[PDB]
Coordinates of C-alpha atoms and ligand atoms in Angstrom, one line a residue:
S1 CA 16.1 32.4 9.6
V2 CA 13.9 29.6 8.3
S3 CA 11.8 27.6 10.8
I4 CA 9.2 24.9 10.7
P5 CA 7.3 25.2 14.0
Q6 CA 6.4 21.5 14.2
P7 CA 7.8 18.5 16.2
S8 CA 9.6 15.9 14.2
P9 CA 8.8 13.3 13.0
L10 CA 5.2 13.9 11.8
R11 CA 3.1 10.8 11.3
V12 CA 0.1 11.0 9.0
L13 CA -2.1 8.5 7.2
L14 CA -2.0 7.3 3.7
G15 CA -4.3 9.2 1.3
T16 CA -4.6 12.4 3.5
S17 CA -3.4 15.9 2.7
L18 CA -0.4 17.4 4.3
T19 CA 0.5 21.0 5.3
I20 CA 3.9 22.0 6.5
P21 CA 4.1 25.6 7.7
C22 CA 7.4 27.3 6.9
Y23 CA 8.2 30.9 7.8
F24 CA 11.3 33.0 7.3
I25 CA 12.7 36.5 7.9
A26 CA 13.0 38.5 -4.3
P27 CA 13.8 35.6 -2.0
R28 CA 14.0 32.1 -3.5
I29 CA 12.0 29.3 -1.8
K30 CA 13.0 25.7 -2.6
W31 CA 11.2 22.6 -1.2
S32 CA 12.8 19.2 -1.4
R33 CA 12.3 15.7 -0.1
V34 CA 15.1 13.3 1.0
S35 CA 14.1 9.7 0.9
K36 CA 16.6 6.8 1.1
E37 CA 19.7 7.7 -0.9
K38 CA 17.8 10.0 -3.3
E39 CA 16.7 13.6 -3.1
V40 CA 13.8 15.2 -5.1
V41 CA 13.1 18.9 -5.6
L42 CA 9.4 19.5 -5.2
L43 CA 9.1 23.2 -6.2
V44 CA 11.1 26.4 -6.5
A45 CA 9.5 29.9 -6.0
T46 CA 10.7 33.4 -6.6
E47 CA 9.2 36.7 -7.8
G48 CA 5.7 35.5 -7.2
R49 CA 6.0 32.4 -9.5
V50 CA 6.1 28.8 -8.5
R51 CA 7.7 26.1 -10.7
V52 CA 6.6 22.6 -9.7
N53 CA 8.2 19.3 -10.4
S54 CA 6.4 17.8 -13.4
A55 CA 5.5 14.6 -11.6
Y56 CA 4.1 16.6 -8.7
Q57 CA 1.8 18.9 -10.6
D58 CA -1.4 19.8 -8.7
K59 CA -0.1 17.6 -5.9
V60 CA 2.2 20.2 -4.2
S61 CA 1.8 24.0 -4.1
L62 CA 2.3 27.1 -1.9
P63 CA -1.2 28.1 -0.8
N64 CA -0.1 31.3 0.9
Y65 CA 2.6 32.4 -1.6
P66 CA 3.0 35.1 -2.9
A67 CA 0.0 36.6 -1.2
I68 CA 2.1 36.5 2.0
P69 CA 5.7 36.8 0.7
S70 CA 7.2 35.4 4.0
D71 CA 5.0 32.2 4.2
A72 CA 6.6 29.2 2.5
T73 CA 3.9 26.8 3.7
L74 CA 3.9 23.6 1.6
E75 CA 0.8 21.6 0.9
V76 CA 1.0 18.0 -0.3
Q77 CA -2.2 16.2 -1.5
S78 CA -2.9 12.5 -1.8
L79 CA -0.1 11.3 0.5
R80 CA 1.7 8.2 -0.8
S81 CA 4.1 5.9 1.0
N82 CA 6.9 7.3 -1.3
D83 CA 6.0 10.8 0.0
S84 CA 7.6 9.9 3.3
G85 CA 11.0 11.4 3.9
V86 CA 12.8 14.5 5.3
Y87 CA 11.2 17.6 3.8
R88 CA 13.6 20.6 3.6
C89 CA 12.3 24.2 3.4
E90 CA 15.2 26.2 1.9
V91 CA 15.1 30.0 1.3
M92 CA 17.8 32.0 -0.5
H93 CA 18.2 35.8 -0.4
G94 CA 21.2 36.8 -2.4
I95 CA 24.3 34.9 -1.4
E96 CA 22.7 34.0 1.9
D97 CA 20.5 30.9 2.5
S98 CA 19.3 28.8 5.4
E99 CA 16.9 25.9 5.8
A100 CA 14.6 23.9 8.1
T101 CA 13.8 20.2 8.0
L102 CA 10.9 18.0 9.0
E103 CA 10.7 14.2 8.7
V104 CA 7.3 13.0 7.5
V105 CA 6.2 9.4 7.9
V106 CA 3.2 8.3 5.9
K107 CA 1.6 5.4 7.7
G108 CA -0.4 2.5 6.2
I109 CA -0.6 0.1 3.3
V110 CA -3.5 -1.0 1.1
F111 CA -3.6 -4.7 0.0
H112 CA -6.0 -6.8 -2.0
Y113 CA -7.6 -9.7 -0.1
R114 CA -9.2 -12.9 -1.5
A115 CA -10.9 -14.7 1.3
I116 CA -10.8 -18.4 2.2
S117 CA -14.2 -18.8 0.6
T118 CA -12.3 -17.9 -2.6
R119 CA -12.8 -15.5 -5.5
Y120 CA -15.6 -12.9 -5.4
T121 CA -17.4 -14.4 -2.4
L122 CA -17.5 -11.3 -0.1
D123 CA -20.6 -9.2 0.1
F124 CA -20.2 -5.7 1.6
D125 CA -20.7 -6.9 5.2
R126 CA -18.3 -9.9 4.9
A127 CA -15.8 -7.7 3.0
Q128 CA -15.6 -5.5 6.1
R129 CA -15.1 -8.4 8.5
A130 CA -12.4 -9.9 6.4
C131 CA -10.3 -6.7 6.9
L132 CA -11.1 -6.6 10.6
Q133 CA -9.8 -10.2 10.9
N134 CA -6.6 -9.2 9.2
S135 CA -5.5 -6.2 11.3
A136 CA -7.1 -3.6 9.0
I137 CA -10.3 -1.9 8.0
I138 CA -11.9 -1.7 4.6
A139 CA -10.0 0.9 2.5
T140 CA -11.4 4.2 1.2
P141 CA -11.1 5.3 -2.4
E142 CA -8.6 8.0 -1.4
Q143 CA -6.4 5.3 0.1
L144 CA -6.7 3.1 -3.0
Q145 CA -5.9 6.1 -5.2
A146 CA -2.8 6.8 -3.3
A147 CA -1.7 3.1 -3.4
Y148 CA -2.3 3.1 -7.2
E149 CA 0.0 6.2 -7.5
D150 CA 2.6 4.1 -5.6
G151 CA 2.5 1.5 -8.4
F152 CA -0.3 -0.8 -7.1
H153 CA -1.7 -2.9 -9.9
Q154 CA -4.3 -5.5 -9.2
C155 CA -6.9 -6.9 -11.7
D156 CA -9.4 -8.1 -9.1
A157 CA -12.5 -6.1 -8.2
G158 CA -13.0 -5.4 -4.5
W159 CA -15.3 -3.6 -2.2
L160 CA -14.4 -0.2 -0.7
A161 CA -15.5 1.7 2.4
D162 CA -17.9 3.9 0.3
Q163 CA -19.8 0.8 -1.0
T164 CA -18.1 1.0 -4.4
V165 CA -16.2 -1.8 -6.1
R166 CA -12.9 -0.8 -7.7
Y167 CA -9.5 -2.2 -8.7
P168 CA -6.3 -0.3 -9.8
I169 CA -4.7 -0.9 -13.2
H170 CA -1.4 0.4 -14.5
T171 CA -1.2 -1.9 -17.6
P172 CA -4.6 -2.1 -19.4
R173 CA -5.3 -5.5 -20.9
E174 CA -8.2 -7.7 -21.9
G175 CA -10.1 -8.6 -18.7
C176 CA -8.9 -5.5 -16.9
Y177 CA -10.2 -2.7 -19.1
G178 CA -13.2 -1.8 -17.0
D179 CA -14.7 1.6 -17.5
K180 CA -11.4 3.2 -18.5
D181 CA -10.3 1.1 -21.5
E182 CA -6.6 1.6 -22.4
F183 CA -6.2 4.5 -20.0
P184 CA -4.4 3.8 -16.7
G185 CA -6.2 4.3 -13.4
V186 CA -8.5 2.8 -10.8
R187 CA -11.5 1.2 -12.5
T188 CA -14.8 1.4 -10.8
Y189 CA -18.2 -0.3 -11.0
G190 CA -19.9 2.5 -9.0
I191 CA -22.0 2.0 -5.9
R192 CA -23.2 -1.6 -5.8
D193 CA -25.9 -3.4 -3.9
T194 CA -24.5 -4.8 -0.7
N195 CA -25.5 -8.4 -1.5
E196 CA -23.1 -8.5 -4.5
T197 CA -20.0 -10.6 -4.0
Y198 CA -16.4 -9.4 -4.8
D199 CA -13.0 -9.4 -3.1
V200 CA -12.0 -6.4 -0.9
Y201 CA -9.2 -3.9 -0.4
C202 CA -8.0 -3.5 3.2
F203 CA -6.1 -0.6 4.7
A204 CA -3.7 -1.6 7.5
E205 CA -2.6 1.5 9.4
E206 CA 0.1 0.3 11.8
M207 CA 1.2 -2.5 14.1
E208 CA 3.1 -2.3 17.5
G209 CA 5.0 -5.7 17.3
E210 CA 7.2 -7.5 14.9
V211 CA 6.7 -10.3 12.4
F212 CA 9.1 -13.2 12.3
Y213 CA 9.4 -16.8 10.9
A214 CA 9.4 -19.9 13.0
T215 CA 10.4 -23.2 11.3
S216 CA 11.4 -26.8 12.0
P217 CA 13.1 -29.6 10.0
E218 CA 9.8 -31.1 8.9
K219 CA 7.8 -27.9 8.8
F220 CA 4.3 -27.3 10.3
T221 CA 0.7 -28.0 9.5
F222 CA -1.6 -25.1 10.1
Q223 CA -2.6 -26.1 13.6
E224 CA 1.1 -27.1 14.4
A225 CA 2.1 -23.6 13.2
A226 CA -0.5 -22.0 15.5
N227 CA 0.9 -23.9 18.4
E228 CA 4.5 -23.0 17.6
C229 CA 3.8 -19.3 17.6
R230 CA 2.0 -19.7 20.9
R231 CA 4.8 -21.8 22.4
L232 CA 7.2 -18.9 21.6
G233 CA 5.0 -16.4 23.4
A234 CA 3.5 -15.0 20.2
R235 CA 0.7 -15.8 17.7
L236 CA 0.1 -16.3 14.0
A237 CA 0.5 -13.0 12.1
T238 CA -2.4 -11.7 10.0
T239 CA -2.2 -10.9 6.3
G240 CA -2.3 -7.2 7.2
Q241 CA 0.6 -7.6 9.6
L242 CA 2.6 -9.4 6.9
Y243 CA 2.0 -6.6 4.4
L244 CA 3.2 -4.0 7.0
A245 CA 6.2 -6.2 7.6
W246 CA 7.0 -6.4 3.9
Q247 CA 6.6 -2.7 3.6
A248 CA 9.3 -2.3 6.2
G249 CA 11.5 -4.5 4.1
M250 CA 10.9 -8.0 5.3
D251 CA 12.2 -10.8 3.0
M252 CA 11.9 -14.5 3.3
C253 CA 12.0 -17.1 0.4
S254 CA 9.7 -19.6 2.2
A255 CA 6.0 -19.9 2.3
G256 CA 4.4 -19.9 5.7
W257 CA 1.0 -20.1 7.5
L258 CA -0.9 -16.9 8.5
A259 CA -3.7 -16.5 11.0
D260 CA -6.4 -16.6 8.3
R261 CA -5.3 -20.1 7.2
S262 CA -3.6 -18.6 4.2
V263 CA 0.0 -19.3 2.9
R264 CA 2.1 -16.2 1.9
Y265 CA 5.6 -15.0 2.0
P266 CA 7.3 -11.5 1.6
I267 CA 9.8 -10.6 -1.1
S268 CA 11.8 -7.3 -0.9
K269 CA 14.5 -8.2 -3.5
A270 CA 13.5 -9.3 -7.0
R271 CA 15.1 -12.6 -7.7
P272 CA 14.1 -15.2 -10.3
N273 CA 13.8 -18.2 -7.9
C274 CA 12.2 -16.2 -5.1
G275 CA 9.0 -14.4 -6.0
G276 CA 9.5 -14.7 -9.7
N277 CA 11.2 -11.4 -10.1
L278 CA 8.3 -9.7 -8.4
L279 CA 8.2 -7.6 -5.2
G280 CA 5.4 -7.8 -2.6
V281 CA 3.5 -10.5 -0.6
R282 CA 3.3 -13.7 -2.7
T283 CA 0.3 -15.9 -1.9
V284 CA 0.2 -19.6 -2.5
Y285 CA -3.0 -21.0 -4.0
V286 CA -4.3 -24.5 -4.7
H287 CA -5.5 -23.8 -8.3
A288 CA -3.7 -21.8 -10.9
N289 CA -6.5 -19.2 -11.2
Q290 CA -5.5 -18.0 -7.7
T291 CA -8.3 -19.8 -6.0
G292 CA -8.3 -21.9 -2.8
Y293 CA -6.1 -21.7 0.3
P294 CA -3.9 -24.7 0.8
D295 CA -5.1 -27.7 2.8
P296 CA -4.5 -27.3 6.5
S297 CA -2.4 -30.5 6.5
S298 CA 0.1 -29.0 4.1
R299 CA 3.4 -28.3 5.7
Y300 CA 4.8 -24.8 5.7
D301 CA 6.7 -22.4 8.1
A302 CA 5.0 -20.4 10.8
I303 CA 4.7 -16.6 10.4
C304 CA 4.4 -15.2 13.9
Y305 CA 3.6 -11.9 15.5
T306 CA 4.8 -10.8 18.9
Ligands
LIG1 C1 -22.6 -5.2 -14.1 C2 -21.8 -4.7 -15.3 O1 -22.2 -4.9 -16.4 N1 -20.7 -4.0 -15.0 C3 -20.1 -3.1 -15.9 C4 -18.8 -3.6 -16.4 O2 -18.9 -4.9 -16.9 C5 -18.0 -5.8 -16.4 O3 -16.6 -5.5 -16.7 C6 -15.7 -6.3 -16.0 C7 -14.3 -5.7 -16.1 O4 -13.7 -5.4 -15.1 O5 -13.8 -5.6 -17.2 C8 -15.8 -7.7 -16.5 O6 -14.9 -8.5 -15.7 C9 -14.0 -9.4 -16.3 O7 -14.7 -10.5 -16.9 C10 -13.7 -11.4 -17.6 C11 -14.6 -12.4 -18.4 O8 -15.4 -13.2 -17.5 C12 -12.8 -12.0 -16.6 O9 -11.8 -12.8 -17.3 C13 -12.1 -10.9 -15.8 O10 -11.3 -11.4 -14.7 C14 -9.9 -11.3 -14.7 O11 -9.3 -12.1 -15.7 C15 -7.9 -12.0 -15.7 C16 -7.2 -12.9 -16.7 O12 -7.6 -14.0 -16.8 O13 -6.3 -12.5 -17.4 C17 -7.3 -12.2 -14.3 O14 -5.9 -11.9 -14.4 C18 -5.1 -12.1 -13.3 O15 -5.0 -10.9 -12.5 C19 -4.2 -11.1 -11.3 C20 -4.4 -9.8 -10.5 O16 -3.6 -8.8 -11.1 C21 -2.8 -11.5 -11.7 O17 -2.1 -11.7 -10.5 C22 -2.7 -12.7 -12.6 O18 -1.4 -12.9 -13.1 C23 -0.9 -14.2 -12.8 O19 -0.6 -14.3 -11.4 C24 -0.1 -15.6 -11.1 C25 0.0 -15.7 -9.6 O20 0.2 -14.8 -8.9 O21 -0.1 -16.8 -9.1 C26 1.3 -15.6 -11.8 O22 2.0 -16.9 -11.5 C27 3.0 -16.7 -10.6 O23 4.0 -15.8 -11.0 C28 5.0 -15.6 -10.0 C29 5.8 -14.3 -10.4 O24 6.6 -14.6 -11.5 C30 5.8 -16.8 -9.9 O25 6.7 -16.6 -8.8 C31 4.9 -18.0 -9.6 O26 5.6 -19.3 -9.7 C32 6.1 -19.8 -8.5 O27 7.3 -19.1 -8.2 C33 7.8 -19.5 -6.9 C34 8.8 -18.5 -6.5 O28 8.8 -18.1 -5.4 O29 9.6 -18.0 -7.3 C35 8.4 -20.9 -7.2 O30 9.0 -21.4 -6.0 C36 10.3 -21.5 -5.9 O31 10.9 -22.6 -6.6 C37 12.3 -22.6 -6.7 C38 12.7 -23.7 -7.6 O32 12.3 -24.9 -7.1 C39 12.8 -22.7 -5.3 O33 14.3 -22.6 -5.3 C40 12.3 -21.7 -4.3 O34 12.6 -21.9 -3.0 C41 13.9 -21.6 -2.6 O35 14.8 -22.6 -3.1 C42 14.7 -23.9 -2.4 C43 15.4 -25.0 -3.2 O36 15.8 -24.7 -4.3 O37 15.4 -26.1 -2.7 C44 14.1 -24.1 -1.2 C45 13.6 -22.9 -0.4 O38 12.2 -23.1 -0.2 C46 13.9 -21.6 -1.0 O39 15.2 -21.1 -0.6 C47 10.8 -21.6 -4.4 N2 10.2 -20.5 -3.6 C48 9.7 -20.7 -2.4 C49 9.4 -19.4 -1.7 O40 9.4 -21.8 -2.0 C50 7.3 -21.9 -7.6 O41 7.8 -23.1 -8.0 C51 6.5 -21.3 -8.8 O42 5.3 -22.1 -9.0 C52 3.7 -18.1 -10.5 N3 2.8 -19.2 -10.1 C53 2.6 -20.2 -10.9 C54 1.5 -21.2 -10.4 O43 3.2 -20.5 -11.9 C55 1.2 -15.5 -13.3 O44 2.5 -15.4 -13.9 C56 0.4 -14.3 -13.7 O45 0.0 -14.4 -15.1 C57 -3.7 -12.5 -13.8 N4 -3.7 -13.7 -14.6 C58 -3.4 -13.7 -15.9 C59 -3.8 -15.0 -16.6 O46 -2.8 -12.8 -16.5 C60 -7.9 -11.3 -13.3 O47 -7.5 -11.7 -12.0 C61 -9.4 -11.5 -13.3 O48 -10.1 -10.6 -12.4 C62 -13.1 -9.9 -15.2 N5 -12.4 -8.8 -14.5 C63 -12.5 -8.6 -13.2 C64 -11.6 -7.6 -12.7 O49 -13.4 -9.2 -12.5 C65 -17.2 -8.2 -16.3 O50 -17.3 -9.5 -17.0 C66 -18.2 -7.2 -16.9 O51 -19.6 -7.6 -16.6 C67 -18.2 -2.7 -17.5 O52 -16.8 -3.0 -17.6 C68 -18.2 -1.2 -17.0 C69 -17.9 -0.3 -18.2 O53 -18.8 -0.4 -19.3 O54 -19.5 -0.9 -16.5 C70 -19.9 -1.6 -15.4 O55 -21.1 -1.1 -14.8
NAG2 C1 6.8 3.4 -3.5 O1 7.6 2.8 -2.5 C2 7.8 1.4 -2.6 C3 8.5 1.0 -1.3 O2 9.1 -0.3 -1.5 C4 8.6 1.1 -3.8 O3 8.7 -0.3 -4.0 C5 7.9 1.6 -5.0 O4 8.6 1.5 -6.2 C6 7.6 3.1 -4.9 N1 6.8 3.7 -6.0 C7 7.0 4.8 -6.6 C8 6.1 5.2 -7.7 O5 7.9 5.6 -6.3
NAG3 C1 -28.8 -8.9 -5.0 O1 -30.2 -8.6 -4.8 C2 -30.9 -8.2 -6.0 C3 -32.2 -7.7 -5.6 O2 -32.8 -8.6 -4.7 C4 -30.9 -9.5 -6.9 O3 -31.6 -9.2 -8.1 C5 -29.4 -9.8 -7.3 O4 -29.3 -10.9 -8.1 C6 -28.5 -9.9 -6.1 N1 -27.2 -9.9 -6.5 C7 -26.3 -10.9 -6.4 C8 -24.9 -10.6 -7.0 O5 -26.6 -12.0 -6.0
NAG4 C1 -10.3 -22.2 -11.1 O1 -9.8 -23.5 -11.5 C2 -10.4 -24.6 -10.8 C3 -9.6 -25.8 -11.2 O2 -9.8 -26.0 -12.6 C4 -11.9 -24.7 -11.1 O3 -12.5 -25.6 -10.2 C5 -12.6 -23.3 -10.8 O4 -13.9 -23.3 -11.2 C6 -11.8 -22.2 -11.5 N1 -12.4 -20.9 -11.3 C7 -12.8 -20.4 -10.1 C8 -13.5 -19.0 -10.3 O5 -12.7 -20.9 -9.0

C-alpha cells in the first residue's frame, strides 16, 4: 500500500532541492528513476541502513528513515536536468511488494553568453540586461553548479546573480586552471567590483511557444530575417529560447539569425560535418577567437519563435 500524495507531474527549477513524500503500510525500500530508455536505482533501505548509489552520494537520502520506519520520503539535492524522470517508490515486505510513481520535470537551462560588444565587455549591470534580452535572468551559483554536474564545460569567465564571476571546467588545462588547478569544478574569482567586465551566464526557465526555422533559396540578411519571422506571424527567437529548444532535442545543420543579431544553430546528434562532433548550440563568430557577431548583411536562415 505505497502512495505518493502528490499530483503528477511535478515541475521544479534547476538547482533546487526536491522532496518526494512516500508512505506505506524489516521492509525493503527501493527508490529508482526512469529516464528515457534507462533506469537508475537511487537507493535501497532495510533494517535501518540506507545504501546509496555511488554517483548520488550526499545528493539523495531518506531524511525520516529509520526514525519513522513507515516514511520513505526521498530528498534530492542540487536538481539537474538529468534528474528529471519518473521516480518510483518501491517497498517490499517478504514476497509482497507494491510501488508508487511520480514524474518529475526539472525546468531550465544555463548557457554562457558573449555579447555583441564581444568578449569580456559586460559589467554587472549590462550582464543582467543581456540575460533579460535573451529570455532569461542572470544565473545563480546553485544553477551553475547543477549545470556543471550535467556536463557543462565553458572556459569563459562570466558574471553571476551573486556578483561573483565563475566558469565551469571539467577538463583542466592551461588558461582554464583558475583557483582549482587540475581539479575539476566551477572556478571562481570571488565577488568582483561591478565595473569589471566579463561575459555572463544566463538561466532560461521556460518558454510557452515553439522555435522553428524559416528559410529561402537565397537566405536572409538580419533585417530580412526579422521581417520573415514577422510575416509568418512570429518573431526572431532569442538565444535563451534556442537553448531551450535544443534542450528539447531541436537539431538543424544550418546557421540562422537570432533576435540579438547573433548567428547560432542547434545540434542534438553528434556528426562530423554538423557541429564538429559536438552537441549543443553552436555559435558562428567572425574571428577565430570566438569574437564578433557576423555582419548584418551576411545571409543566413531565420530562427523564429511563435
Ligand atoms: C584578478 C586576479 O588576479 N584574479 C585571480 C586569478 O588570475 C586570473 O586567472 C585567470 C584564469 O581563469 O586562469 C586568467 O585568465 C586566463 O588568462 C589567459 C592568459 O591571458 C587567457 O588565455 C585565458 O583565456 C582563455 O584562453 C583559452 C585558450 O586560448 O585556450 C580559451 O579557450 C577556449 O575556450 C572556449 C570555451 O570553452 C572553447 O570553446 C575554445 O575551443 C575552441 O572553440 C572553437 C569554437 O567553438 O569556435 C572550436 O572551433 C570549432 O569547433 C567546432 C567543433 O568541432 C567545429 O564545428 C567548428 O568548425 C566549423 O564546423 C562547422 C560544422 O558545423 O561542423 C563547419 O560547417 C559545416 O561545413 C560542412 C562542410 O562544408 C558543411 O557540410 C556543413 O553544412 C551542411 O552541409 C552543406 C553542404 O555540404 O553543402 C550545406 C548545409 O549548410 C549543411 O547541410 C557546415 N555546417 C553548417 C551548419 O553550415 C565549418 O566549416 C567549420 O568552420 C570549429 N570552428 C572553426 C572556426 O574551426 C575549436 O575547435 C576549439 O578549440 C577554447 N579555445 C582553445 C584555443 O582551446 C578560453 O575561451 C579563454 O577564456 C584566461 N581565462 C579566462 C577564463 O579568462 C587571468 O589571466 C588571471 O589574471 C587566479 O587564477 C585566481 C587563483 O589564484 O585568483 C584570482 O583572484
Ligand atoms: C544531461 O542531459 C543531457 C540532455 O541532452 C545529456 O546530453 C547529458 O549527457 C546529460 N548529462 C549527464 C551527466 O547525465
Ligand atoms: C573599477 O573601478 C576601480 C575603482 O574605481 C578601478 O581601479 C578599476 O580599474 C575598475 N575596473 C575595471 C575592470 O575597469
Ligand atoms: C581576436 O582576434 C582578432 C583578429 O585577429 C583580433 O582583432 C582580436 O584582438 C583578438 N582578441 C580579442 C580579445 O578580440
